[PDB]
Design a protein around this ligand. Structure first.
Ligand SMILES: CC[C@@H]1C(=O)N(C)c2cnc(Nc3ccc(C(=O)NC4CCN(C)CC4)cc3OC)nc2N1C1CCCC1
Length: 120
């Protein structure tokens, strides 16, 4: 992938805020459905995603565009809403983190530019 102003913002502003949040801990690592005794998790959730995975991807410049990274964040939250019961606290935890995600995303740089300065 590459490094852009928007990806750097997702890494150093958005991920920094979410990763340290009180509610982050269910989302800092992939779901281990074997240890949790949930054999239906991977039948229902076809694209697992978590903040540990996103953070590693950002660290390794996996993304080409901030929108791909935002889609991983979105997939993470959506998986939560799809699999769990509407009244579960983890749903309100996801909704809390997602609102911060959106509020932080609103102040992201407008024009995506690769953070690169090259000798022609
Ligand atoms: C998968 C379904 C749904 C969901 O979407 N995600 C993301 C999820 C992510 N993580 C968890 N749960 C746990 C996550 C990590 C741990 C953990 O680290 N446990 C330690 C084990 C060793 N020892 C040090 C003591 C504690 C324990 C968990 O069980 C509560 N649950 C999740 N749920 C919930 C499933 C039960 C209600 C909803």
């Amino acid at each position: 992938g590459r490094v852009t102003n928007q990806l750097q913002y997702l890494h150093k502003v958005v991920m920094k805020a979410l990763w340290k949040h009180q509610f982050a801990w269910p989302f800092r690592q992939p779901v281990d459905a074997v240890k949790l005794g949930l054999p239906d998790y991977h039948k229902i959730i076809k694209q697992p995603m978590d903040m540990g995975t996103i953070k590693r991807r950002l660290e390794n410049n996996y993304y080409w565009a901030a929108s791909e990274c935002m889609q991983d964040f979105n997939t993470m939250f959506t998986n939560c809403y799809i699999y769990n019961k509407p009244t579960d606290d983890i749903v309100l935890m996801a909704q809390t983190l997602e609102k911060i995600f959106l509020q932080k995303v609103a102040s992201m740089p407008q024009e995506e530019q690769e953070l690169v300065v090259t000798i022609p």
